Amino acid sequence: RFLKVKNWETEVVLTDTLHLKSTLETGCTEYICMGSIMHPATKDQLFPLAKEFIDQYYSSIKRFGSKAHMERLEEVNKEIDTTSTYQLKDTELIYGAKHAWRNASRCVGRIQWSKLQVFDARDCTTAHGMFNYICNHVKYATNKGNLRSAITIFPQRTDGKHDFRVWNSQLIRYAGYKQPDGSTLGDPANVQFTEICIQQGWKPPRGRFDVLPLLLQANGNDPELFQIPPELVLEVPIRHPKFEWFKDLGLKWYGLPAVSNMLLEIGGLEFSACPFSGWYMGTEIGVRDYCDNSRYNILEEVAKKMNLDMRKTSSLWKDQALVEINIAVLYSFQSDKVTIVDHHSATESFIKHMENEYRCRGGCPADWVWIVPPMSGSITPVFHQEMLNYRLTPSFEYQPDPWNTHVW
Amino acid sequence: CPRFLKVKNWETEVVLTDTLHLKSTLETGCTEYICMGSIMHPDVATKDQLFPLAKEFIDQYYSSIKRFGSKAHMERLEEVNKEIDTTSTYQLKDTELIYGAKHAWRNASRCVGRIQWSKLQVFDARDCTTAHGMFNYICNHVKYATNKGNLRSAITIFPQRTDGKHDFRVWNSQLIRYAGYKQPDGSTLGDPANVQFTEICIQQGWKPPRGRFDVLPLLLQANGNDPELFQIPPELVLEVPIRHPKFEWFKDLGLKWYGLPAVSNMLLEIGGLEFSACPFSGWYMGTEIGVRDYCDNSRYNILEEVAKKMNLDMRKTSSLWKDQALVEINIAVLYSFQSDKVTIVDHHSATESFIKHMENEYRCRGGCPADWVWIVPPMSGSITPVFHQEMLNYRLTPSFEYQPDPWNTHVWK
Ligand code: HEM
Ligand code: HEM
Numbered sequence: 001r002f003l004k005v006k007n008w009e010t011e012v013v014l015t016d017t018l019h020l021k022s023t024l025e026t027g028c029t030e031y032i033c034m035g036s037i038m039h040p041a042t043k044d045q046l047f048p049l050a051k052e053f054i055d056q057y058y059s060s061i062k063r064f065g066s067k068a069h070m071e072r073l074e075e076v077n078k079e080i081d082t083t084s085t086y087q088l089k090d091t092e093l094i095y096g097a098k099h100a101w102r103n104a105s106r107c108v109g110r111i112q113w114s115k116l117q118v119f120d121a122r123d124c125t126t127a128h129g130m131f132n133y134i135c136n137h138v139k140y141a142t143n144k145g146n147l148r149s150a151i152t153i154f155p156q157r158t159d160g161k162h163d164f165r166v167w168n169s170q171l172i173r174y175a176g177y178k179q180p181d182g183s184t185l186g187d188p189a190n191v192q193f194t195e196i197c198i199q200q201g202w203k204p205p206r207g208r209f210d211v212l213p214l215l216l217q218a219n220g221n222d223p224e225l226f227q228i229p230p231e232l233v234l235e236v237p238i239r240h241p242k243f244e245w246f247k248d249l250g251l252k253w254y255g256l257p258a259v260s261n262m263l264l265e266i267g268g269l270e271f272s273a274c275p276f277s278g279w280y281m282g283t284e285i286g287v288r289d290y291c292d293n294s295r296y297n298i299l300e301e302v303a304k305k306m307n308l309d310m311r312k313t314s315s316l317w318k319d320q321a322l323v324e325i326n327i328a329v330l331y332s333f334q335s336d337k338v339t340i341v342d343h344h345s346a347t348e349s350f351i352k353h354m355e356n357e358y359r360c361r362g363g364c365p366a367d368w369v370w371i372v373p374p375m376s377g378s379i380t381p382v383f384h385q386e387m388l389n390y391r392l393t394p395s396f397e398y399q400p401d402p403w404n405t406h407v408w
Numbered sequence: 409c410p411r412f413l414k415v416k417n418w419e420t421e422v423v424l425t426d427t428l429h430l431k432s433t434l435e436t437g438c439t440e441y442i443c444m445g446s447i448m449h450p451d452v453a454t455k456d457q458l459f460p461l462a463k464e465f466i467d468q469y470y471s472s473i474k475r476f477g478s479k480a481h482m483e484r485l486e487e488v489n490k491e492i493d494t495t496s497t498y499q500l501k502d503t504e505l506i507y508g509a510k511h512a513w514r515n516a517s518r519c520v521g522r523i524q525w526s527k528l529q530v531f532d533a534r535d536c537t538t539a540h541g542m543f544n545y546i547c548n549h550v551k552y553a554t555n556k557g558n559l560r561s562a563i564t565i566f567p568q569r570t571d572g573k574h575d576f577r578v579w580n581s582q583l584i585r586y587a588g589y590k591q592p593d594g595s596t597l598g599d600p601a602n603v604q605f606t607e608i609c610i611q612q613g614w615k616p617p618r619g620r621f622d623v624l625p626l627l628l629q630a631n632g633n634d635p636e637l638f639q640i641p642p643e644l645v646l647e648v649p650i651r652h653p654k655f656e657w658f659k660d661l662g663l664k665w666y667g668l669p670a671v672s673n674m675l676l677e678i679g680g681l682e683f684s685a686c687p688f689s690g691w692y693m694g695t696e697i698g699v700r701d702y703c704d705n706s707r708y709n710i711l712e713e714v715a716k717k718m719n720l721d722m723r724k725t726s727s728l729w730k731d732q733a734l735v736e737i738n739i740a741v742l743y744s745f746q747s748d749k750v751t752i753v754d755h756h757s758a759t760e761s762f763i764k765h766m767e768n769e770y771r772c773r774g775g776c777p778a779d780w781v782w783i784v785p786p787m788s789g790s791i792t793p794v795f796h797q798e799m800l801n802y803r804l805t806p807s808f809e810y811q812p813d814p815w816n817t818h819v820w821k
């Protein structure tokens with residue numbers, strides 16, 4: 001049935017037909033909603049998925065049922081038959097990668113979806129090769145501050161014993177170190193991964209913002225360490241436009257968010273290594289990275305320097321400090337001509353995107369829990385926007401951390 | 409359905425195990441292929457529909473008082489069954505009514521204040537027959553709940569639905585709210601949320617003062633009759649003028665708000681019985697006033713004026729002038745209620761208490777249904793502990809439910 005979503009602020013009603021195309025499961029049932037749970041082949045399984053995907057590709061270029069379409073299905077069937085898998089055409093690789101982004105219900109940045117530079121790395125065979133492809137990606141995407149969205153796609157899974165994996169959760173991240181006195185220097189989120197690099201031979205500077213090395217696994221082999229050339233790593237010193245003391249906090253961050261631990265699924269094929277990157281929404285750094293208790297956790301320090309009353313929660317000293325940090329982040333990136341978007345501009349673009357997608361596509365799967373920013377929720381337009389969440393393919397999926405499945 | 413569902417807290421690593429979901433009674437709207445978790449709102453019971461619903465509830469009650477399977481349990485079951493057979497409905501005992509109301513609150517997935525669920529004063533108004541009587545009961549409720557600023561949670565329960573043509577309804581969405589007035593020029597005076605209701609009151613004969621904060625009259629329907637207007641005695645309406653501990657100019661904005669949040673348009677369902685008029689009240693979380701009531705664009709919408717008084721650059725969104733003003737307004741709200749000794753809770757305290765409540769519930773009850781979309785506060789989400797807390801949402805009974813607005817269904821006499 002057609003489903004309607006209302007925006008309670010504008011009263012705009014949109015009608016969703018697209019959800020009828022979903023075949024994957026969401027996690028919820030008729031009796032239990034799991035909307036806030038973070039994470040809820042064979043030849044025989046493979047062809048219908050391949051077919052589903054070839055069909056929507058040829059439907060998308062408006063040549064559904066053409067001789068080209070009929071021949072492609074044939075070629076794929078034969079290939080699955082004779083090899084237990086198949087290879088995508090370049091055009092298909094690009095189409096599928098753009099559509100995995102378009103379908104990512106949790107991403108507020110999807111107005112950009114069709115502007116994605118796709119780097120085909122399916123000829124890669126070694127960790128050195130992966131490193132080369134990754135450097136090129138970082139250089140292209142960074143573009144001296146004028147960030148460009150990109151994805152690099154490594155060879156698809158075969159038997160599962162020969163996966164290509166980027167072990168890093170993002171290409172560029174800061175180390176975290178467990179201290180004898182039990183505290184944590186650097187980023188506490190990366191403590192484990194940092195330990196694995198150390199155990200593997202990495203000589204740690206033991207600073208607060210040490211860029212981690214790349215740990216790269218090719219064809220199921222043991223992962224290998226590489227240092228990203230520093231000239232490729234663009235960073236922004238965080239300062240505040242009014243508090244001249246803010247720079248004295250010694251804060252910085254990297255300009256390029258490049259998630260590298262997801263799995264890209266296209267037409268039944270699985271790409272376990274597909275680092276992709278866009279640009280930051282300010283809150284990702286200013287709210288979560290800096291102010292999560294289990295992350296850099298700087299609220300106290302900033303609040304101190306602001307000389308706030310931190311004796312009672314109801315003084316909202318945390319909220320005040322939170323806003324000023326986010327002002328600083330946006331100001332710093334903007335002053336250094338590095339692409340960044342604030343949560344007001346971003347959510348506004350997402351609403352427009354939604355309207356675009358309902359109009360041309362019959363809907364837009366969206367995960368309110370993720371779309372709504374981690375501060376000032378209800379003063380952004382998405383807070384008041386009803387969303388429907390459903391899973392469309394091609395997609396980006398979670399996968400297990402490689403140190404839990406890998407034998408050495 | 410799997411027997412054990414686990415929820416994780418991503419900042420503390422605490423994992424909890426839910427079994428209570430097995431007691432889920434109604435559908436959420438989600439299916440295996442779509443989630444409707446951000447959808448706001450996704451003819452009487454027959455004899456045969458009522459029997460198992462009553463038995464389900466009676467069993468649950470007797471289990472709660474450790475008298476399950478007792479002679480008193482079996483006798484109550486038999487007496488209820490007889491009543492349904494010979495009258496096609498039944499009446500709850502006072503003990504059952506009280507247990508039912510507390511549990512509807514305990515089960516309200518969207519409520520962050522549920523640590524308090526067992527301290528609810530229940531006023532039984534099932535003897536009420538007229539709108540003047542409803543007025544008396546509501547006045548008493550307001551006075552008791554207000555308690556000179558030391559607010560006490562309470563519910564007043566009017567007679568249950570019979571044939572559906574004799575419903576008791578409070579037409580107001582909350583017992584105390586401010587009027588809204590649409591102007592010929594398109595502007596709105598007062599609270600734009602309440603324009604429709606205000607118009608209805610004016611048509612019913614209410615003479616509007618036409619101010620910015622006019623307390624709306626009660627519009628009360630008894631026994632399916634046409635609703636009637638009553639003015640709440642103003643001494644019963646506790647209000648707090650909003651000022652700011654630093655900004656001396658904040659008081660010159662002339663804002664105030666009422667101390668008692670008393671939702672009055674919901675339906676209470678107990679054992680298949682339907683109480684269409686069951687006004688209940690607790691106390692405010694500051695953000696309900698400082699974020700939603702004041703800063704929603706479709707509400708009082710004061711961010712701009714505050715921002716201007718704060719001398720902020722309002723030319724770029726990326727200056728975060730809105731966020732900056734929003735915090736100051738919420739500081740003013742908490743400061744003003746605390747100064748006037750009217751109970752209020754800030755969003756940090758409330759969410760931390762809720763996490764403790766939820767953990768206790770998982771341990772003593774086997775779960776705690778929770779709607780993350782509603783539980784996470786409308787500002788500063790991720791610096792409260794509920795943001796990182798996985799939740800499971802499902803519907804248990806007794807429960808509070810939405811019902812249509814009565815002016816849309818009322819057959820005028
Ligand atoms: C171009 C600028 C972009 C912006 C501003 C943006 C913004 C965001 C934000 C703020 C989130 C929430 C992340 C979090 O809170 O941890 C997110 C999620 C996500 N984004 Fe985007 N994004 C962008 C580009 C991209 C690109 C290029 C891709 C892939 C080709 C992508 C795919 C995803 C996916 C799959 C998620 C969900 C991840 C998960 O489920 O854990 N995004 N995005
Ligand atoms: C005593 C202190 C209380 C606090 C701090 C509190 C807090 C809240 C808050 C902040 C919300 C979301 C409000 C919104 O954004 O509109 C809510 C919703 C709700 N509350 Fe509580 N509440 C309290 C008492 C009560 C009581 C006494 C009842 C019933 C007996 C109750 C039942 C509900 C229900 C049913 C909802 C969902 C409303 C809806 O779905 O529209 N609460 N509560």
Ligand SMILES: CN(C)Cc1cccc(NCc2ccc3ccc(N)nc3c2)c1
Pocket residue numbers: 109169170257259260261262277278279280281284
């Ligand atoms: C844990 N892994 C999924 C990697 C990881 C680490 C930390 C945060 C996230 N967030 C997911 C995510 C995915 C894509 C993004 C694209 C752009 C952007 N600015 N943030 C994005 C964020 C993802």
Ligand SMILES: CN(C)Cc1cccc(NCc2ccc3ccc(N)nc3c2)c1
Pocket residue numbers: 521581582669671672673674689690691692693696
């Ligand atoms: C729509 N109706 C349920 C009435 C209505 C009007 C305006 C706001 C709300 N919010 C829901 C709601 C329900 C119960 C509450 C109890 C206490 C409190 N502080 N807020 C509460 C808020 C509810």
Ligand SMILES: C[C@H](O)[C@H](O)[C@H]1CNc2nc(N)[nH]c(=O)c2N1
Pocket residue numbers: 008383384385386387445446447448781782783
């Ligand atoms: C679209 C969305 O469901 C709607 O804006 C909800 C979001 N969460 C909410 N949460 C609370 N507490 N109160 C609300 O009114 C809402 N509104």
Ligand SMILES: C[C@H](O)[C@H](O)[C@H]1CNc2nc(N)[nH]c(=O)c2N1
Pocket residue numbers: 035036037038369370371372418795796797798799
């Ligand atoms: C429990 C909850 O699902 C979890 O904390 C989610 C909440 N919403 C989020 N939203 C975004 N954008 N990013 C996140 O990491 C999370 N975390």
Ligand SMILES: [Zn+2]
Pocket residue numbers: 028032033034035438439442443444445
């Ligand atoms: Zn759901």
